[PDB]
Symmetry: D2
Subunit: 505 residues, 4 copies
């Protein structure tokens, strides 16, 4: 007989696990507990801080919620207006010395006329081909070229997406992009070119909110704080080392055994297969592909440069920098970096030189957060990637040679992106139903490995819907139908449902 017995055991307290726990808590029927090897919940949605007081998320995290249930829980966790800042969704592509507003194709009037000609000719071919197309594209690369044409594809989406996925676009599927037919809006693109118009896809109605304090990790700390503590086990004490699916027993690092009826596992499924000592599954999970993420943080002395302005995140297709995305993290909250009166010495100049003077000088400060991908098809030299990133900031005119860097951050995350390879779905249909047949709900960014439902809200709801399926027989829509959940406002499920209203009365 195990040390602990619950109806539903949740493994992992990132957004997916916390989601399962929140729904389990709301329903308040079956017994449950949640474990995590980390003392701080949040997983890849956590936040680090440098010794100099600069916060960094695990790369650019911007919330775009598809669900009221997610909203309810974030509101409960951080109920004050002062707990959040709101920003418009401002992003640009760096291309040929210019900041081109996203979406790229609507803004190519910024490029030289000769480049515009190439882009439009390319898009005209794609329009004419789309007119007689009667097959769906089979790879990411095909989808891109059918949408954009060759010229526009080559300038942005093709090289950018290799830099992101660390695999060629020709090796990825394209179903994860949704149901929209791959064809250009030639009229829109030519119209902006003719008018000499630029326009970004943001405005007063395209916004996101970011926690005032603690970065994205502040959300999951606060969400986890609403749970009954005695149903949690976070830290070394909650590290899972063995899963015996046949016995329905989990063994923790310290020897504790937990017997479960149903298991919601949100750890990476390849980790799960190993903990299961299941050779068949280890074999299958090894067929999945993923990239690692290097997060580089740079803290900079000065008031925010005009050339930076209200930019939020930024895309880099070109090979004059190693990162694919930059985030002006200091724009997200004034509390992501020290107050202006905090005194810090200059660590280095952006040109790589180190000043002799160790004088601590005041701010204000701003902060850049960068991401570099790694895979078996794209190695990263860990010893030089910080300096290479900083030179990249100089090349892209984000930093002047003389800008004073007062803090640096670098951390490599092993499981960063689950890759939508051509083989992904075939491998998953062998893995997830096998786990299902053992009453294991493997869910989450790497729990179920689908990037198209791999954001914070998706992950949260993968956990919530897994519990809802377990308890109430609900359809796991986010898991099986990403296009369905992503194409609608999901408003039906709420932190207070009729069940709780009727019960209280």
């Amino acid at each position: 007989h195990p040390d602990i017995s619950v109806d539903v055991l949740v493994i992992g307290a990132g957004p997916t696990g916390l989601g399962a726990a929140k729904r389990l808590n709301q329903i308040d029927g079956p017994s449950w507990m949640i474990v995590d090897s980390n003392e701080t919940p949040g997983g890849l949605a956590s936040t680090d801080v440098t010794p100099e007081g600069f916060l960094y998320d695990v790369g650019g995290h911007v919330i775009a919620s598809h669900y009221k249930y997610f909203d309810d829980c974030l509101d409960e966790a951080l109920p004050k207006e002062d707990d959040w800042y709101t920003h418009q969704r401002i992003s640009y592509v760096r291309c040929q010395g210019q900041w081109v507003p996203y979406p790229f194709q609507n803004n190519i009037s910024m490029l030289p006329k000769e480049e515009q000609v190439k882009c439009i000719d390319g898009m005209i071919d794609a329009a004419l081909e789309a007119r007689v197309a009667n097959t769906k594209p089979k790879t990411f690369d095909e989808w891109i070229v059918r949408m954009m044409g060759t010229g526009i594809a080559d300038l942005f989406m093709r090289p950018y997406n290799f830099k992101v996925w660390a695999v060629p676009t020709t090796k990825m599927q394209c179903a994860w992009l949704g149901e929209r037919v791959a064809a250009p809006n030639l009229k829109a693109v030519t119209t902006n070119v003719i008018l000499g118009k630029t326009a970004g896809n943001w405005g007063p109605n395209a916004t996101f909110r970011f926690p005032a304090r603690g970065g994205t990790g502040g959300i999951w700390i606060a969400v986890a704080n609403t749970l009954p503590k005695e149903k949690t086990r976070f830290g070394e004490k909650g590290k899972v080392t063995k899963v015996n699916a046949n016995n329905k027993t989990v063994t923790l690092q310290d020897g504790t055994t937990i017997g479960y009826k149903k298991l919601v596992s949100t750890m990476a499924v390849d980790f799960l297969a190993e903990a299961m000592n299941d050779q068949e599954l280890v074999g299958l999970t090894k067929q999945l592909f993923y990239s690692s993420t290097h997060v580089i943080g740079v803290g900079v002395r000065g008031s925010r440069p005009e050339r930076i302005g209200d930019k939020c995140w930024l895309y880099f297709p070109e090979d004059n920098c190693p990162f694919y995305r930059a985030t002006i993290f200091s724009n997200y909250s004034p509390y992501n970096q020290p107050e202006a009166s905090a005194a810090l010495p200059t660590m280095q100049l952006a040109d790589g030189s180190r000043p002799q003077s160790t004088e601590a000088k005041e701010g204000p400060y701003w902060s850049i957060m960068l991401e570099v991908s790694e895979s078996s098809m794209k190695p990263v030299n860990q010893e030089t990637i910080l300096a290479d990133c900083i030179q990249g900031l100089v090349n892209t005119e984000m930093l002047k040679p003389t800008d004073e860097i007062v803090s640096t951050y670098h951390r490599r995350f092993d499981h960063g992106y689950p890759t939508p390879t051509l083989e992904r779905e075939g491998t998953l249909t062998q893995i997830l139903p096998k786990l299902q047949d053992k009453d294991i709900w493997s869910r989450g960014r790497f729990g179920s490995w689908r990037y198209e439902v791999g954001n914070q809200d998706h992950s949260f709801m993968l956990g919530v819907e897994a519990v809802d399926n377990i308890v109430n027989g609900a359809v796991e829509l986010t898991l099986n139908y990403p296009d369905f959940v992503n194409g609608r406002q999901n408003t039906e499920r709420r932190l207070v449902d009729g069940a709780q209203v009727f019960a209280k009365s």
Copy 2:
């Protein structure tokens, strides 16, 4: 204060209302009750019997279930193998003296060669147009011609659907038919013509089960008998006469008032509007279109004629009979008509003659169930429709002039089919939200008025999902996404869910 108060009130005990009742009874959380103006539950899924012992459903009723939950409840209601009979889904189209197997286009080798040429040429045109189509059809008629071509459309789907819907195909939408592209399978059609092949879309895998006793109506009597009797109020004592949405009170025939927190209403929504005394809603619901259904039943003396054989239902595009559909109801269960040793006099011969003898003679017996539509665009003479129907049986060679009729049946159902007109959605998206804002879930074949989810299983699940939405925040998938639920096996929701399992432990 009202005579009775419940959390959830369900009006109507046809399949939709019984679905709501079943799910409420399973959840066993919020209080509830169900009412009906009829002492016998079933609604349009009920069964009548003639004084001579011939059963008739409300027209051809064949179960094609898309949900496990539905199956669960039917298995619970009628658990014995002896409670059901299984049959292949056998149907034909009556065309030019021939019984053409369904689907019609795959079987036109039974037509004159010169006619096959016109059909194939028509479909060739449709195939060539479909290759370069860049728009969806906007009407049912356009959908039909794009799928079949002019020649085949004119033989079956165009005149048949006018006879069913009592409105022209050009006046109806086609979104209700689902997301499949409107285009011909030219090779399938030419292949069967070249091979001289006939092929029906049935066999060992394509079957349905039909209740052994009491007709389709026996299902719903049995399902209702699983409910706690005291939460039911069926008969004149259960007839709703007034709905006060602002006070959340319902008034019954006998003066009884019921207070509710949430209302699931499964009566026709135009009747609901009347019972609410809501002028705006009455205005809107009057803009909805529907057809009435005449059901004609004919009991015939004799063993099953060879020409009839194992036929189940039959379509009639042509103008030599008033019915659009016939069902060989005696093929569905040997208990839909009297036993062979039951003695009955011949009422008339099929050509209308008097019988040579008026004394009771034994069987065996077989039985035909016919349907005739009526609308403001297609009147039906009630005084002569029985006689016209019987003449139709002769014209279509279903009866010989000498066949002996031993029982007749005629009944008119006012609300028969909810019509997918071009205007339907424009109207419903004005009605259903207004009811929703008053905590009224109006659901069902005429509760929510959508034929594409208008079968028994759809209706049951509309009730089930409305409750699940009320109590558990579930998405009402059947109501809002017909294509979703009809395109998948809906297996997640069960009559015993996790909630009930964990509760008992």
Copy 3:
């Protein structure tokens, strides 16, 4: 017995008849004779001169030769290099205050940006339609809109062609335009728009030669002068008044009778039918459509204005002027107008004002030749057309209000354009075979009524080929296959053929 008898009689000494005569004279086999009612040969390719010394062709006459035989005869007639001037084929379209280089669609970068967007959107639509087109256009109007799209059609070719043909584009065929697929060159058009580029279809190799003296008329006088005079009868003494097809006799004005074996008639075929007193033929030729041509000439004091420059001819789609085409005739030869030292009084200013002085003043001078079309569907007030033309010159900014007019010219030509109506070929294929059966070769711009082979070189060659058919059994290629002769340089037939070479030896 007639007064004169020849093997081949040619009626008319315009280009077509002179072609017949040149070939007859070269062959020197059958006896022959050519007549004309005008003392001066040249027909519609003749030239008038005002009392003040300004020459005017019959509207813009620019030579574009498809035949070396035509070239040979022109070289023979006017052999000196001093006999000709060479110019680039410089043309513009007047649109919205701008001189837009031809071809119009390649130069819409000159238009307002909002208009460019509408133009490009229309041509995108045409490009996409053209990709799936499986039918030929059936009218001139369809041809135009399929080539240009709605926006560009509406700016130039649709209104301009009404002004030219004096019938709507919807009433004309399009076979006469050749074999080219009706489809846009979207890339060409978008590229110049993107580049902000203009480009006319002319250059050092896109030229024409014009006679130094006597206008276009000087060519045909010189060509006719190479013929044996005694075989020509030009003037009142050459006016044909009756053609007895049955007796192969022609009666002239003065009563001279001419017997022939074969007749080449180059007069208008409706006049020929009348001269034949052939009722059936009069009816048929009456079904042919044609427009009349008003030629207006304006002589202007001053050196060539900068705004005019090297412009040759000009197209006018808009309604602020009655003419469809303008020619800067002073640019074709310095001898089309008086020398600078010639003294002329100012007749009026361009705004209609009297001059300050009526004294004869010196030049230099320049000159504009205008064309206005007339038909039953487009009446022309002959009393006001000159004044309206001059106002149109001010409206289009060809003339300043202050420009001094020193000579005016106006002549109406009854048969100006033979119209490619939808009915043209139905009618011609009844007329030409009947004439042929009587050994009458009716040929020429109105002799056979086909505009697509209606220029000077076509006409000349129609005469030549008619003779070559009569004598040598040659195919009349220009007559029956416009696309054939227009799509090649016809090099085989020369003014000195093998026959004359072998004979001289």
Copy 4:
């Protein structure tokens, strides 16, 4: 000074050279002379006779005249009604044990139904592709598949054409087939399949005439007889051995020298290059490709078998016979083989065995003429080809094993077909203009090497038009525009033109 000087010298007295001769003779202007190495005119349009009295043309020769001039000369040469037999153009394809009427695709209803399905499926694919096709086919093979689809292509046009051209279809151009769009008539093919219908492309209006006596060669002997004998030089005395293009002198085998001004050469252009000792031309003409033709004749004892009947020529795509075409040559004229009273011994039975009796026996007799192609890509065993052909006749059921063969014939013609390879035009546009500049008109089946104008009428007219271009400056239409002459009735040029009429008077 050469022995003989003429204005125009014609080398070769096949149809092309005779055409040149007839036109020169008609014009009666320049002096001329025609030479041939054979005593008998006709070339590949000649006829051999076996020692047993069986005539054979050089393979099946059936006249289909596009020209009135050709008709004129044939009528002059053979003026009597009994100089000719008229037959319908009856042809069949041998395929899977059956004679299928030509055109094959309209008659596939004769094939097994499953095979019809594959044929129609293939043609449906090709129709759908043709609906969106915007490129011309570039090879003969692409052309075939676009017209027929894969299934039908593989049954007839692909294997047959390899057997004809002795090169794969993928190695040939397709321009030579004309301007018709490469696309199936799906409706016509499926219609005959549906109706179970067969129809050949012949009847009372689809006929050919054949000379009563002497085979096809009788025509050209007769045409030659109309020429002034002293201007002909036929046999060893007329064999050209050397051409000196710079001196314009031809040397004959007997040493005779002929000076010319213009040369019409109708020998194979690769032979002409050799005779010119022009190494550049030798190299060029070696790039042309041709196949050799083996003609096999089989004379058979008996009245014409019913299984043969009225068949004229027959196509053989399959591998059970080496010949590609058979002609029932005894059907073309009763004088193509001996009268029934002629006594001949049986040489062998068709199964290869010796005859029972070696005695001369009476007829009647019938006769089969076969063609086998050979090239560097398709070698032929010349030692066994007669036996292989005879066995081929047994395999195809044209002959019974017991049929008595009384005569056999085999002759290999080295230049048989000029092959429309992909390279042909690139080579010919270097050859023919180079010869042209030297005043050499190289014309004819191998004179100018274009099979699409390679029949008797084409050839004849290539000669006629060469002369007409040399003397009258005519366009060489047949040479340069095959689609033009083939697509019309060429009626303008006659054996008596106006020139001869006007001169006689």
